[PDB]
Design a protein around this nucleic acid. Structure first.
Ligand SMILES: [Zn+2]
Lengths: 980, 187, 149, 113, 108
DNA sequence: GGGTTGGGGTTGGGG
RNA sequence: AUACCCGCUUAAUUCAUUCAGAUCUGUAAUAGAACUGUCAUUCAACCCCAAAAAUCUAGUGCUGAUAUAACCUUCACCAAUUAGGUUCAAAUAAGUGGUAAUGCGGGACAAAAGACUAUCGACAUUUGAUACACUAUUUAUCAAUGGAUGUCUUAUUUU
């Protein structure tokens, strides 16, 4: 198994198990005697036959032989033949040609839209009918998987069973579902009831399914009466003083907030910022929260009800529940497995299942107890915390779950309200205050109505079409600032490649420029956006629903295996599309272009969404920009300068508006530099901007004039700035709006560039910080292997992209990127193994049994890490730069990268010292890899000496690098400086 | 006694009808070509749960009763009713559809039909269900049908609902259409 | 269009008309009192001819007004079991000879062959009279509503 | 090779001779010879048509009604051509049958044939 | 006072199913299957009487159990000679294990 | 008497 | 077994009380004194981009030849750092940061054997078979355990 290549789709298909016959149309016809070698038909039809691909579960070529002539084949219409073939199916479903069909007894009409039908009915198919005849045509259509070619790397499945149902599936329930704990339901409560006494609307102020008969249910009812009496007869105010007390300056805060509400006019901002910070400081420790919750639990529920030992274990589990971060939830078994079914005396041994199968008995009791605990938590703990606490997080921070007291959050909400100083069945919205800093920047939402959600989606696809149109227009010639909406590495790659080209040709000595914009969403003018909308660069649009399935990122075993795979691993996606009176490629494919490696696929569905004119978009603009009744609790007012946040299209709208402005501005500036000599490039996000130019004087004059014309219409911003020094009118502008700062190695929104070598890094941080705010962990419930393979493929953030395709960058920079991202990868991964290793069960009756040993940890983790390293050494389809043909440097290169992987793993397993007993074994595997690769580096020298092909530009160049810097002992002792 | 009409007349009236108009007619047609690509049943409580709250693992909790319940699955089927004059896409209620499934097979009880079908589809018994659906084609019957020219989310349309399904009766349907023929000759 | 009830006499007339008249700017269709492409007929299922090479059973049929023959077809397994689906209600009698009153459907196409579609027996001649009187009224209303449309 | 088979009755004596027609009716005198019975055509009673049956009759495998074809001998005898006896639950409306016959054949089957 | 005997057990019966059937009663015991017959010893006469009243059927007023789907009658009135033979056999097992441990100490 | 269908997954950036 | 573990206990009384009025007492102008109503459908994930899924898959690779530059351990717990030593596989410690709630008493002399076949063919120790079971679990038998297990004590002293 060397690597992936462009493709060979016949091999790709026939290389899979389920279908046992695979061929093309032409050779199949030759075999079935329908055609002969002298069948010199029309040339285009001949390439049609050759490119057409067919397959079937059986080699029914025998069923498709000639066996007779009876040459009548007189005049049957192709439409009629297809109708008869469809009727032959009857009740069967999910075949391609089935779509858009009204089977009416023995009659059909045609509905919806099917471009694949237009691909059908061709002169090709007419000739095909002339060849097959009636029955052959009908049965070939019903049976075989018909695949034809429309595009270089576009192939249709116009017939056969739909691949969807073939590739969609992925007495029972050995453990039952154990319904979830809705931790999400703890977020964003805005409700006060004059006192504690959490919910008078709850059960405080039902049935059962599978209890021990119902006597246990009666005991449960009695104990619920007990806890109801306790809840009625326990004050919470003093407990809140004890554990989650308010700040001692509470009344002073109230007074200053009230005075601010009255007359904070123009003497507010600083004091309000300090007040916001102070109120943010009113958080409560997780440990205090846990103790408060535990006291609540003790005051109401019997330790005899829960068992004493199980009661204590659950009390311990409470802290884990509070600690664990957002979008995470402990399953019921996460407590049950540490519960005892025998610490409760009153459990009923009905039928003595203990004496029938005590394991079945314990499983049943575990089910019962788990349901009871789910009841307790969902009906008690979650409501209590929801009413007594606001649960939120910091946007600039992440998933750290902060708690706050309701009155404090209410006062903060009032302070936000005073800061709002800024037809149809209406799609109303809802406000959510978002903590961002020692200040706030909230968000919007659209909710509560199916129709509101659907029209929201309609806006989504129509502006997605708008984004496609603007993307194409920008790519051909930027209507925006040019090179602006790069959408995750496209323009970044083009940018970097071009700048590399001048660094090779022009002057690598350059000068970066940072730039920021504040409140881009609210810098939008309704009248002018409508005007520029009347430019109307797209009318007569329509939609087609998509069913694509193509080219996952994984290799396929050759026909030298030494199993049973299915015809998938070309994972599906889903896209919407647009069309008008234009080139026929969009009419046929219903998809424009996406670069990949050369394996086709295309399948289309039928649907008729109608949106032809920008007038409907104009109606929605009237929906949004003029009327809005977004209510936090009762508010209807809204800042009217700018598109509201939380709107699912505000990004594209802001992009289009700044396209309007940068049209003129960038026209001026880019044409100036085109006359100058054009050593300059640009990129602009929604509100962030970077600029590059060697001529600091010219570029800085450009900065001055662009900031001038941009701020000539009331658009402000303030943040750090560029190494460019003064240009005194620039200093005047700085005094006007924002301070200026100077520092090399331009940092970014999450990347940075040593622009001297133009080496682009992303980020480096600390282990605890990386643990905070972002880590979320899955649970090993008969999903461990898949969970871990894909979660160690969590290189699926940036370290599989954006940096291993520079096309020129030296291996020093490549490996620097690699090991930095590896460091970050471990920093974020360590929680995974740390958590799931605490339940490393030698008793896993399936995982551990298949493992075949009680040391599951050692070899299972060895397997998963070594497999991931294999994945990343095989993922270098990017590395056709330097390895595509040389046939041995591929192995050398991938083994070197594996060595980097293993060295990082060595460092961080020394970090993981507490598992030494098999850390030693892992290190043994590592050292094996390291030293065998040292041998491989020695051997590659002799291989190069014995081999003849040179490829000076790439192969010889990288060989020079790896010989001059990686000579046995060198490799380590130069790359370690390169590590530094 | 009742009256009988034609598919063409019914479609003409529905085309010349407005919102909120429901008129019932009786025809001698048959059923054929049941559509099955869509779901075949829905959930409802014993107390006719208007919005039974959804819970995964097939857990049922109604809101019109607000207790743990035994589920009530009602099988919804769509087909086409045709006669010597026309054809209409029609929707059959669970009760009459289950009566038809009892007719084709008395093994499954009336109310047992939805549960049995759901068990079949979840288990993998699909081909037998398809064959049984095939067995229902061209089933001559007496049909009571009403129609509504309502609007479905800001788009006007025409919908039909078959209420009563009855066995055909040549002795009097022939008399009906013969006297219609006599009236036509007299005119 | 919709399926129409016909008989051997009218279909013979229509076949002869299709033979004689080329019917320019038309074809692939049989037009009578209007136009049609599919028929329902109640007659007696006639002798079962055994043709098997490319085609299958040549099922004859006959009414009080004529004698016609239609075809069924399969290649290897396509229409053997459904052929039995059609044909049990003939075969399982085991004492009816092979001539019984039956209602079936046929598809018309501008080609000298008639394909059988679906078949069932008729047990009461009340239904035979029904079919006849229905087709009579159908042509009456068809002609005098197309000409009065 | 096409042989006509109209429908006639007593009120059409003249159609008995040399005109191969279709005969229907319920065997009133269920004669056990299995070769010659007396039946009533589409009327209430007294349509005493002699039916020279097929030499075998499934006298007990079906119901009363039988249909055959052929020429009618002047004493209202029927020469056997083809038996199509039915298993009937709902008997004939002989009124409906008579209306159909002597109305369609009167004008419209006449306008047809 | 602490002995019962299961008779007419189906041929080829293993000890696991018979001890499980006795465990259906839920009382600890020790079983010995010979030839056929299964002699059961319980810890005390109180639990023996409890097992007697649990295993007796009032329909036929006799001590019966289910073995492999068949009905097997059991006897609690053990003959004196058979009880003496069982006690000798059990003490034989006791002193056999004692002598085995003794000789095992003896090889050292 | 219902009826497109509601939620799983939560990783970087923007807002 | 050693600085800790285990068996036993805990320790407080208005930090607060929004908005919708409603009784409006206080009405100078509002304290206050309250009742209800609550998320009330809980509304829900804020979207947009973007990058990946072994599928119900178990790919099975680089065979151990090297790091002399790797390796070792200490502080109530964890983390960073430091030094020390080894250089073959293990004895060193310190610093700093973060984490560990409370009162009483037992684990207790620095531990293995002595003899009792003492308790046992009734004992428990796995393995592999059957019946179960089954994602976090054990059943009775079969073989083997065979000492499975407890009883006295470790320095009449620096034994
Ligand atoms: Zn209900």
């Amino acid at each position: 198994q060397m690597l992936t290549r462009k493709e060979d789709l016949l091999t790709v298909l026939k290389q899979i198990s389920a279908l046992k016959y695979v061929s093309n149309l032409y050779e199949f016809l030759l075999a079935t005697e329908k055609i002969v070698q002298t069948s010199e038909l029309d040339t285009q039809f001949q390439e049609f036959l050759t490119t057409t691909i067919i397959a079937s579960e059986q080699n029914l070529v025998e069923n498709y032989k000639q066996k007779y002539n009876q040459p009548n084949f007189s005049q049957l219409t192709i439409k009629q033949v297809i109708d008869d073939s469809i009727i032959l199916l009857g009740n069967k479903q999910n075949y391609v040609q089935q779509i858009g069909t009204t089977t009416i007894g023995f009659y059909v009409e045609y509905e919806n839209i099917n471009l694949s039908r237009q691909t059908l009915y061709s002169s090709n198919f007419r000739n095909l009918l002339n060849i097959f005849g009636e029955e052959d045509f009908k049965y070939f259509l019903i049976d075989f998987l018909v695949f034809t070619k429309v595009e270089q790397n576009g192939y249709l499945q116009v017939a056969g069973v739909c691949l969807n149902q073939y590739f969609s599936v992925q007495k029972q329930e050995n453990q039952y579902i154990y319904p979830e704990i809705q931790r999400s339901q703890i977020f964003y409560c805005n409700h006060m009831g004059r006192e504690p006494g959490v919910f008078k609307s709850s059960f405080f102020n039902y049935q059962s399914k599978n209890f021990s008969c119902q006597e246990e249910r009666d005991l449960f009812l009695e104990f619920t009466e007990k806890i109801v009496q306790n809840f009625h007869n326990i004050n919470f105010n003093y407990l809140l003083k004890k554990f989650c007390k308010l700040p001692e300056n509470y009344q002073s805060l109230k007074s200053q907030v009230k005075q601010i509400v009255q007359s904070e006019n123009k003497a507010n901002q600083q004091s309000c910022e300090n007040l916001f910070n102070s109120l943010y400081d009113t958080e409560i420790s997780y440990k205090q929260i846990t103790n408060f919750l535990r006291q609540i639990i003790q005051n109401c529920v019997p330790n005899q009800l829960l068992g004493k030992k199980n009661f204590k274990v659950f009390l311990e589990k409470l802290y884990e529940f509070v600690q664990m971060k957002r979008f995470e939830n402990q399953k019921v078994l996460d407590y049950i497995c540490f519960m005892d079914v025998f610490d409760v005396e009153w459990f009923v041994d009905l039928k003595n299942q203990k004496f029938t199968q005590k394991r079945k008995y314990i499983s049943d009791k575990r089910k019962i107890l788990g349901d009871l605990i789910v009841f307790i938590i969902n009906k008690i703990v979650i409501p209590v915390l929801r009413y007594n606490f606001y649960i939120t997080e910091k946007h600039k921070e992440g998933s750290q779950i902060f708690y706050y007291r309701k009155p404090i959050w209410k006062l903060v909400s009032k302070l936000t309200i005073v800061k709002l100083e800024e037809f149809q069945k209406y799609p109303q919205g809802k406000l959510r205050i978002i903590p961002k800093k020692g200040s706030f920047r909230p968000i919007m939402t659209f909710l509560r109505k199916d129709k509101q959600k659907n029209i929201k989606l309609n806006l989504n696809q129509i502006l997605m079409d708008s984004q496609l149109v603007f993307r194409n227009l920008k790519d051909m010639l930027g209507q925006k600032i040019g090179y602006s909406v790069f959408d995750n590495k496209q323009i970044s790659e083009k940018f970097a490649q071009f700048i590399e080209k001048w660094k090779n040709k022009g002057r690598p000595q350059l000068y970066y420029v940072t730039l920021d914009i504040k409140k881009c969403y609210d810098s939008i003018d309704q009248m002018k956006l409508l005007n520029f909308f009347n430019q109307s660069d797209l009318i007569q649009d329509t939609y087609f629903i998509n069913k694509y399935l193509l080219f996952q990122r994984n290799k396929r075993p050759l026909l030298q295996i030494q199993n049973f795979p299915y015809y998938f691993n070309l994972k599906e996606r889903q896209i919407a599309y647009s069309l008008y009176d234009d080139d026929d490629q969009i009419l046929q494919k219903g998809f424009k272009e996406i670069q990949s490696d050369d394996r086709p696929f295309i399948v289309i569905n039928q649907d008729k969404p109608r949106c032809i004119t920008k007038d409907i978009i104009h109606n929605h603009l009237k929906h949004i920009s003029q009327y809005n009744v977004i209510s936090f609790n009762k508010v209807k007012f809204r800042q009217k300068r700018g598109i509201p946040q939380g709107l699912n299209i505000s990004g594209v709208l802001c992009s289009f508006y700044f396209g309007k402005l940068e049209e003129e501005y960038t026209q001026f500036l880019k044409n100036a530099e085109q006359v100058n000599g054009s050593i300059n490039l640009l990129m602009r996000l929604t509100d962030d901007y970077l600029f590059i130019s060697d001529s600091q004087q010219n570029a800085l004059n450009l900065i001055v004039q662009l900031q001038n014309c941009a701020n000539n219409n009331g658009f402000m911003f303030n943040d750090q700035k560029i190494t460019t020094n003064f240009q005194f009118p620039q200093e005047d502008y700085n005094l006007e709006h924002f301070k200026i700062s100077v520092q090399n190695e331009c940092q970014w929104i999450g990347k940075s560039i040593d622009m001297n070598t133009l080496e682009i890094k992303s980020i480096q941080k600390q282990t605890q910080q990386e643990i905070n705010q972002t880590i979320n962990v899955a649970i090993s419930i008969k999903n461990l292997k898949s969970q871990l393979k894909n979660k160690l493929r969590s290189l699926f953030l940036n370290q599989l992209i954006d940096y291993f395709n520079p096309n020129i960058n030296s291996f020093e920079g490549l490996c620097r990127q690699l090991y930095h991202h590896s460091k970050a990868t471990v920093m974020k991964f360590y929680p995974f193994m740390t958590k799931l290793f605490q339940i490393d069960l030698k008793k896993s009756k399936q995982y551990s049994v298949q493992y075949g040993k009680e040391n599951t940890n050692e070899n299972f983790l060895k397997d998963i890490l070594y497999y991931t390293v294999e994945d990343v050494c095989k993922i270098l389809c990017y590395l056709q730069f330097e390895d595509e043909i040389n046939s041995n440097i591929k192995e050398i290169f991938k083994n070197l990268y594996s060595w980097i992987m293993w060295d990082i793993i060595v460092s961080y397993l020394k970090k993981k010292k507490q598992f030494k007993g098999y850390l030693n074994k892992l290190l043994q595997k590592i050292r094996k890899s390291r030293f065998f690769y040292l041998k491989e580096g020695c051997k590659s020298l002799q291989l190069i000496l014995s081999q003849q092909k040179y490829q000076l530009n790439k192969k010889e160049l990288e060989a020079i690098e790896f010989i001059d810097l990686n000579n046995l002992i060198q490799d380590i002792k130069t790359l370690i400086p390169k590590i530094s | 006694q009742r009256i009988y009409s034609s598919i063409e007349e019914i479609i003409q009236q529905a085309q010349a009808s407005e919102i909120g108009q429901k008129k019932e007619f009786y025809v001698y047609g048959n059923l054929v070509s049941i559509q099955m690509k869509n779901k075949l049943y829905y959930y409802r409580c014993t107390c006719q749960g208007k919005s039974v709250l959804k819970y995964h693992g097939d857990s049922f909790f109604c809101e019109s009763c607000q207790q743990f319940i035994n589920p009530q699955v009602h099988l919804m089927l769509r087909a086409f009713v045709q006669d010597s004059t026309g054809t209409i896409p029609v929707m059959i209620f669970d009760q009459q559809s289950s009566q038809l499934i009892n007719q084709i097979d008395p093994s499954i009880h009336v109310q047992e039909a939805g549960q049995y079908v759901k068990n079949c589809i979840e288990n993998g018994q699909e081909e037998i269900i398809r064959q049984l659906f095939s067995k229902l084609d061209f089933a001559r019957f007496i049909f009571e049908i009403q129609f509504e020219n309502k609007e479905f989310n800001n788009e006007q349309e025409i919908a039909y609902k078959v209420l009563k399904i009855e066995k055909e009766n040549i002795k009097e349907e022939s008399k009906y259409l013969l006297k219609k023929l006599e009236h036509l000759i007299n005119n | 269009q919709i399926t129409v009830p016909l008989n051997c006499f009218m279909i013979n007339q229509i076949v002869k008309a299709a033979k004689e008249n080329p019917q320019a700017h038309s074809g692939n269709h049989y037009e009578w009192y209007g136009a049609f492409e599919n028929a329902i007929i109640t007659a007696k299922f006639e002798f079962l001819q055994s043709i098997n090479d490319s085609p299958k059973i040549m099922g004859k049929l006959s009414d009080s007004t004529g004698c016609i023959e239609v075809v069924i077809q399969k290649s290897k397994m396509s229409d053997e079991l459904p052929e039995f689906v059609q044909a049990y209600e003939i075969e399982l009698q085991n004492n009816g000879n092979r001539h019984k009153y039956v209602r079936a459907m046929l598809k018309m196409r501008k080609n000298a062959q008639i394909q059988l579609l679906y078949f069932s027996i008729v047990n009461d001649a009340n239904e035979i009279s029904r079919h006849g009187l229905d087709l009579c009224l159908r042509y009456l209303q068809r002609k005098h509503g197309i000409e009065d449309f | 090779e096409q042989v006509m088979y109209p429908r006639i009755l007593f009120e059409q004596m003249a159609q008995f001779r040399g005109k191969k027609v279709t005969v229907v009716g319920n065997v009133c005198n269920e004669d056990q010879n299995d070769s010659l019975v007396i039946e009533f055509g589409p009327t209430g009673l007294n349509q005493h048509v002699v039916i020279d049956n097929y030499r075998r009759v499934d006298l007990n495998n079906t119901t009363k009604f039988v249909e055959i074809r052929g020429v009618v001998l002047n004493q209202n005898i029927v020469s056997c051509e083809e038996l199509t006896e039915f298993e009937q639950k709902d008997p004939f409306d002989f009124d409906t049958y008579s209306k159909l016959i002597h109305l369609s054949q009167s004008d419209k089957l006449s306008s047809l044939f | 006072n602490c002995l019962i005997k299961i008779i007419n057990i189906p041929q080829g019966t293993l000890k696991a199913e018979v001890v499980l059937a006795v465990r259906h009663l839920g009382y600890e015991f020790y079983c010995d299957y010979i030839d056929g017959q299964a002699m059961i010893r319980f810890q005390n006469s109180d639990e023996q009487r409890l097992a007697i009243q649990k295993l007796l059927n009032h329909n036929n007023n006799k001590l019966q159990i289910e073995i492999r789907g068949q009905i097997c009658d059991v006897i609690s009135t053990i003959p004196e000679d058979e009880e003496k033979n069982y006690w000798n056999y059990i003490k034989f097992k006791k002193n056999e294990f004692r002598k085995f441990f003794f000789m095992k100490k003896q090889q050292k």
